[PDB]
Amino acid sequence: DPAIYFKEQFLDGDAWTNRWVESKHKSDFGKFVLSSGKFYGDLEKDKGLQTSQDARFYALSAKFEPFSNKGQTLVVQFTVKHEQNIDCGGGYVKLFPSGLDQKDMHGDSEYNIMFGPDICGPGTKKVHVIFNYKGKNVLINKDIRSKDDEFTHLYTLIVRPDNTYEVKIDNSQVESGSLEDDWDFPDANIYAYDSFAVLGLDLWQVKSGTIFDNFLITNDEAYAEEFGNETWGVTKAAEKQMKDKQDEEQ
Numbered sequence: 001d002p003a004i005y006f007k008e009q010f011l012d013g014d015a016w017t018n019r020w021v022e023s024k025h026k027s028d029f030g031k032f033v034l035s036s037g038k039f040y041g042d043l044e045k046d047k048g049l050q051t052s053q054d055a056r057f058y059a060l061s062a063k064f065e066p067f068s069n070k071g072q073t074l075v076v077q078f079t080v081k082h083e084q085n086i087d088c089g090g091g092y093v094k095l096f097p098s099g100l101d102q103k104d105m106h107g108d109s110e111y112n113i114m115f116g117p118d119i120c121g122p123g124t125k126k127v128h129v130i131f132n133y134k135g136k137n138v139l140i141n142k143d144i145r146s147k148d149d150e151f152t153h154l155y156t157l158i159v160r161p162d163n164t165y166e167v168k169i170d171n172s173q174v175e176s177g178s179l180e181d182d183w184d185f186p187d188a189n190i191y192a193y194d195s196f197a198v199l200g201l202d203l204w205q206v207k208s209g210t211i212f213d214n215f216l217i218t219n220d221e222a223y224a225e226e227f228g229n230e231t232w233g234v235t236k237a238a239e240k241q242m243k244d245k246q247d248e249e250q
Ligand SMILES: OC[C@H]1O[C@H](O[C@@H]2[C@H](O)[C@@H](O[C@@H]3[C@@H](O[C@H]4[C@@H](O)[C@H](O)[C@@H](CO)O[C@@H]4O)O[C@H](CO)[C@@H](O)[C@@H]3O)O[C@H](CO)[C@H]2O)[C@H](O)[C@@H](O)[C@@H]1O
Pocket: 057, 088, 089, 090, 091, 106, 107, 108, 114, 118, 119, 120, 124, 137, 202, 203, 204, 205
C-alpha cells in the first residue's frame, strides 16, 4: 500500500478552508480563492487555489500527520497553471518540519525542502530544488527550465534513500542524478529529514491568477505517476480544447 502523506484536490467546495491556514505574519498578504479559472478541463475537477491579487506576497499552508522519509522514497507533486500569462511570480511549494507556527509563516521561516517553478521576467524561468542541509539552504547546481504558458503543468520531485533524485515535468523526466553531485553541500543521510509536517505556499506575484491543484505527497513513485495521469493527464487535452474554443468564438 502506498503511504499517502498528503493529498489535496479541492473537491469539496468551501470546506478546503478547514485544512489550510492563512499566515497573519503580514497584514497585507494577497488572498487565495477557490477557482477553476476562465478555461478548464472540467469545471469541478479543476478547482484549485488561485492567487487573486496583483503585486502581493502569499502565505498559506496545510498541515498533515508528521512523518520522516528516513529509509524510504519521498515524492512531492502538484499542478501549476499560470493562466494569467505571468510576468513575475512563484509557483513552488515548501515542506516544513514539525514546529512551524502556520499563523506566522513567511519567506524566512525555516523549511526542509523547496520545489517548483519560479518565473521573474525572461531572465528567471527556473525550477527550484532546494535542500536545507546543516543550517544552509542549498540550491540545485542544474538549470531546469520552467513552463511559462497559460496551461496546467505537472511538477514532480522524487527523493530516494540511496541519495538519488528525479524531477519530472508533465510526468516526463527532465533532470536526474544524486544529491552528492548536483548540490554543493560523504553523507549517506543527506536525503533524510527527521520530520515533515506542513506544506506551504510562500509566493510573490506581480500579475496574479496562478492556480494550484492536485497536491500529493507520497512514498510511492508509481502511484504519483498514476495519480498524475489521472489528474493533469485528464485536464491537459480537455483544457486545450476549451481554450481553442474560446479563441475561435471570440
Ligand atoms: O529564490 C531562492 C530563494 O527562495 C525563497 O525565498 C523567496 C525570496 O525571498 C523572494 O523571492 C524573490 C521575489 O523577487 C522580487 C521581489 O520580492 C523583489 O523585491 C524584486 C526586486 O528585485 O524582484 C522581484 O519582484 O519574487 C520573485 C518571483 O517569485 C522570486 O524569483 C525572487 O527570488 O520572495 C519569495 C516569496 O516570499 C521567497 O519564497 C527561499 O525562502 C530562499 O531560501 C531561497 O534562497
